[PDB]
């Protein structure tokens, strides 16, 4: 069938920038092309068809161009709510095929994370396994460093991190680091801390708690 190749696979740009995404088909598709936008957590919604014909209610900052096998989607003035994956689609032939997608992220000013630490409840303690949670809330850029400290020694073997998708209003991220231990190991130690370094922080921030 017709192969659709999108470029770039990812991009980041500031609000108000002009960004361009390209789609190359393995053969000519005679302008039978659509562009779709998929916001985080949502179904895709079509921006335009016939490569350049905008759908009702689609903001004018979106435009399409191209011919033959080569097409482009331009966002003239990226907005904070434009965080999304964008897909091209050909409907020249069956089967319908889509491009691989282009993830669009927003560049914005540095924002320091708000750091919180959550000691396990004692239901957790009764369970056999304990999870200590460190939350980095509403920060930019995505890159951050989280160190776990157990009575002052570093414990990084049994932690795992998860990061939200970029927020569609303030363009920040949030991150969880979860340290998983046995109950006997957890109750054999005394103070637990998470230490966060980020571009927005003048000095590393450490949040701590005393077991018991």
């Amino acid at each position: 069938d017709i192969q659709m190749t999108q470029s770039p696979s990812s991009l980041s740009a500031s609000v108000g920038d002009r960004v361009t995404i390209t789609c190359r088909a393995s053969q000519g598709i005679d302008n039978n092309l659509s562009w779709y936008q998929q916001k985080p957590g949502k179904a895709p919604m079509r921006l335009m068809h016939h490569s350049s014909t905008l759908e009702t209610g689609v903001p004018s900052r979106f435009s399409g161009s191209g011919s033959g096998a080569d097409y482009s989607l331009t966002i003239s003035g990226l907005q904070p709510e434009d965080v999304a994956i964008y897909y091209c689609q050909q409907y020249e032939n069956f089967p319908i095929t889509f491009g691989g997608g282009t993830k669009v992220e927003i560049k914005r000013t540095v924002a320091a994370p708000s750091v919180f630490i959550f000691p396990p409840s004692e239901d957790q303690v009764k369970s056999g396994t304990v999870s200590v949670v460190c939350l980095l809330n509403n920060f930019y850029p995505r890159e951050a460093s989280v160190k776990w400290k157990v009575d002052g020694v570093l414990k990084t073997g049994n932690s795992q991190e998860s990061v939200t998708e970029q927020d569609s209003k303030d363009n920040t991220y949030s991150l969880s680091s979860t340290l998983t231990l046995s109950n006997t190991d957890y109750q054999s130690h005394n103070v637990y801390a998470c230490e966060v370094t980020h571009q927005g922080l003048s000095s590393p921030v450490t949040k701590s708690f005393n077991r018991g």
């Binding site: 039978n32 068809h49 016939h50 409907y91 020249e92 032939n93 069956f94 319908i96």
Partner: peptide, 8 residues
């Protein structure tokens, strides 16, 4: 064309 581009 096919799909949304089909013609009858």
């Amino acid at each position: 064309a096919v799909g949304i581009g089909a013609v009858f």
